[PDB]
Amino acid sequence: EELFNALPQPLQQLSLALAGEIPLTDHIFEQAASTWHVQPRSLTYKLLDHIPFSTPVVVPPSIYHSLDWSKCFAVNQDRVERVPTIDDPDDVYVPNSDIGPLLTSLHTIPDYGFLHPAIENDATTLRAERARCASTFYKIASSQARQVKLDPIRMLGFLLLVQARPRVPSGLVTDQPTRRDPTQSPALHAIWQVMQYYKVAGVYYAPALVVPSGAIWWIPPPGKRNVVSVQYLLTDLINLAILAHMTDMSPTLELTGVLMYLRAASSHSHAYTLLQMKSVFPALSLRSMYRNKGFGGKAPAIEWTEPRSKYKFRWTGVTQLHDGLRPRSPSMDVPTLEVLTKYELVDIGHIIIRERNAHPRHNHDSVRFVRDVMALTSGMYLVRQPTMSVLREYSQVPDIKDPIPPSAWTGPIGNVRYLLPSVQGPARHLYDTWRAAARQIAQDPQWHDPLNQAIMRAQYVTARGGSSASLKFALKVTGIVLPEYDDSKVKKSSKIYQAAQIARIAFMLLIAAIHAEVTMGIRNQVQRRARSIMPLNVIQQAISAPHTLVANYINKHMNLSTTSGSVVTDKVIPLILYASTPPNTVVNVDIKACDASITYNYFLSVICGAMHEGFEVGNADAAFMGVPSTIVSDRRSSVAPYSRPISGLQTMVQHLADLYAAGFRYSVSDAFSSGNKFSFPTSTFPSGSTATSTEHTANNSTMMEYFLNVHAPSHVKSASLKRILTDMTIQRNYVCQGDDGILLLPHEAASKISADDMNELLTCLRDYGQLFGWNYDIDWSDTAEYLKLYALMGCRIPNTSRHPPVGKEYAAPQTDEIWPSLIDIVIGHHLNGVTDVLNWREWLRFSWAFACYSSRGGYTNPKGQSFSAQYPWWTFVYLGIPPILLPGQTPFIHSCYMPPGDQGMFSILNGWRDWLISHASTTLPPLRHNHPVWGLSDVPSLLSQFGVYAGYHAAQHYRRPKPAPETASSDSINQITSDLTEYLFYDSALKARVMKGRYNWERLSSSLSLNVGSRVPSLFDVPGKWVAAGRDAEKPPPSSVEDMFTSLNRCIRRPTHSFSRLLELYLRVHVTLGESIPLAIDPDVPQVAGADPANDDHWFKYTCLGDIPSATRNYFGESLFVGRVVSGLDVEAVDATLLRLKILGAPPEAFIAVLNGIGMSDSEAHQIAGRISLANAQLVQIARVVHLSIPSSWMTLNTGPYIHHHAYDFKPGITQPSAKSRDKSIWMSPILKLLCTSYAMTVAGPVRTSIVTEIDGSAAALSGNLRVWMRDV
RNA sequence: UAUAUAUAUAUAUAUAUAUAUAUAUAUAUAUAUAUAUA
RNA sequence: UAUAUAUAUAUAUAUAUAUAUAUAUAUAUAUAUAUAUA
RNA sequence: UAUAUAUAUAUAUAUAUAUAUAUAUAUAUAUAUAUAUAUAUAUAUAUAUAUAUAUAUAUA
Question: RdRp catalytic domain spans which residues?
């Protein structure tokens, strides 16, 4: 491969290491990283010359047809709009224009350019129209290019490097070498052809270059001109090329994707063109697979347990597939082909359909094909001008087909109107439901509990926030002089900052401020319009409390919130799998825009009236959250009007209804556009975070229930449909979360419902939603779409396109981040490639290349010095990336499921133990006195020679700079503290409780001499945590950066030869692997697409353990003792301390002090303390006391039973008696089991039984040291 | 000039039957290559 | 040279899918004729 | 409306006193580490004295 010869020497070495030829070393690790940072990026394109492509792809010159930008922008009413070219009002995206004329030249790199300083000045100072339009166009065009985790060229360099040389085979019988090869990929050939336009003297000038402040462009010569779309096309091509290789797809499918992108790029508005024909691929493949005759195969047999509210499922065998079970819904070929005819891409459909017809039976190949084809959709984070986005989304109002007549209301109650009893229909149903819930909320001593009140107030504060300026204005307007703490370096717009200002003020004085402006933000998306973030101010968030509370009660006490408890997201996995099984018919539904359709004229007025009436049952004089009862005029009786008191809850409703009727008033201040901030109101619900899911899920459930039980039976025609539609209820037939929803039909007896009845049913539902202005957007394709998860016949399909390898969202014109953060990006990037099942061997190779580039970085003072550093590669091992090849071992023996942290280290060393010991003896002189785990052979020196300690400690170092304090600012720190504590401790009982607990605790901890300095979670530190978070949200000063680099280097250079005490002790255990465990399911049945004999290790791991989490006796430790806690503190810290105390045998008052330290009253403290026992605790619950946790990668596997009865901590016939844990086994055995299973999961291949065989020291010695360490911390 | 109904012709779509072509799967025969045995 | 296994090609048979042609039925559009109304 | 004088209030500057916070220096106490000195114990080396053995020289 001449390309391998083209690489420079260090990169050739790195490629050899990645191929598994040689063990990786820090030396070559640096040489590769360094040289990448010094050579120009264009050379990566230069590498493409040495690929003899043989693919049938032609790049039409139609691409280079820049449409003039001047006609794509205009300003009216002093705002820069997009003025769409086509008559479609949605063409509001970046056009296809030549950016060239707007460029100057840089002094550093003369070839590339940036915006004219003249243009931006005139747009800023003169507000000149054309200047502003040019600026806006330049800003957004640059931003669209910036939507990548790093420069795409670097990723392309990674792909070439790994693909430059075939990987060496391992000894495994399932290690199939790659079937795909270069010179056959249409993507790379396409990149070659298109890039031929950008060379002048064989130099291959990149069309653009991304920088921290955005992206720069190259000035074209007089002959040529660069269209911004080309850059986007390159990114899509590179992303597709990487994905195709990792997914190992046929070149034909990649060919179709290339043609797909080219056609989109040829026309104007590359983004808009792609967006229009988005769903073509899933419709062609996923929605229509088995609509033929030769159907068959094996399918999972999943059963839903009787208490369906618990969402518990059981795998109970397999089911043979046959024609009677084949999908009933019509295919999707006709509409898709009709759409494709518009863009004359019918060939793509013909190719896809013909290829699809080669999979008549459901098996691994079929789903693998589906996974690959669905991976063809564009992975670009689309971005448009926020001004257009806000103008296009919130300009919608629902259309009600039968409005509530005005005569249907009673007389006013000051603001609200009650609903007349004579009114029926869905509105009546909605009214009663909310009213009933309001009644239940009304009398509930759960509130007025001071602890619960603390939870609600604390829930309102986060590091982020907004609308602070509106807050300061509104209160200053009403004569309220708020405090300030600027010297305490914390952002004013933080929700924390405004909360501190409010602490002292009597609440009712603030009531006028709730009718104030709210700022807004935008977050871009991959396959849809960008999302919206609308953070209310703290006061508004407080007022809306009743709305949330009632919604919560509706959810938690009707359909159990339809999984909106979100305890572990994986509970939806078995649900959709069950929903997609052949015996069941499922329908996917979701509100078209629930945020935009909920409104006051129809919905909120009804809810407000119901809540206000529902609160009538209760003491009319009972203040709630500092809101006192007031007098309101009642005008229900025209003959006898009067005024009566109303409780604080009702007063809240009175104002809340007023606000909703007035409509939200937003203020847009987009930065990408130029000087165009303004404010306009809308009825669109905020819906900026999970706090909105409760309301929409409640209304979603309510309307669905009424439709099923009342509207549909009264209106449908088919008698058979009526027969099956009856005996159906939401609690066992429907789930939802926000707009999203799933509806599944009762099992038709050995049969399926007529599509005719389905059409009748679906039609009526659409009309039902049309009544009150909900577009239901339903579909029926015998698949499962819920929370962006896809299941087909009980097999999960990872939609990889939603996690593009290169793409990353950036919501601001500047990246605003520092170099070390890139490491965390790499770690998160790699995990997705594990969550989604890719070719695990090749994905690992690519990951290391990414890591190598990220391993190095530098910084420069605003005026002064530069700084630099880089990590030894062992860091990434500690961070959770398996090594490819260790010295003395064979490559590719470590599975991706290897746990991060100490566990991964221990497992690696445990396997590597014997070779290290023997090799150290030959190579080095013995150490001077005996070692606990090692002999005299002195492996630690060898590890230092490998730089293991350097990497091990380097990964421990922090990666974000720290802000500095000040003393007059500390007066503000105290002022900030005092007020935060004041806001937290509204009453006095909590303060007395915490103070008593803290005083007793330190007294006990010192006098009993457990230890001193134990940072125990307590409420007094919660404000401190808030303050630190608030100060951290600020951009750090350069001095902090310099401290980081210096500290990091010193930590790297310091010669240390010891791990943490825990890892040192963990090495004392010897673990061995026996035979394979009995299988969970039939290996024939596919469960996750791509986890097949080709991708062996995933296929092994899933097959052995089974995917369905089925903790019938374990419950994965979710039964934490402290169900109710305040924000800021960590439950996982609290229970760990409690168990640690219990193991240490502390006296009960120690528990009492600790519990009282977090607000628990003495009585409940005793009650809680009594529950603490080593028996009822779960394996993971107790094992976490020493930070032994379950890796996130395991959350999709049924590891419970294995850990329970497959990891033998003491097998009688194998273990040495020295390792017998004896009585301490009650808390020793879980630790050993966790270590054992971690090692077993580390190695590749099938899961084997794990057995402790020996502890070098006695088990007693191990337990004693552990108790010491537990007492120390 | 227009609307409605009926008949006839032509075009398009859907269903069924027959013929031809192409693709895929399975079986059998023949040829060629590679491996093993004699 | 023969046997056995694997791969590829060609021929024949059977099944499935798609396309094209012809026939029949149904729907829609257009033209022409006839009737009725304006 | 203005000027001059006196009194009172508010703001700004400067000086002095008191309180609180932060930094620096000095003193005292306590803990830990290192060095040195003195005493006691054990080991090793060297020197001197006495006894015994062996070798060599001289005398009888």
Answer: 560-797
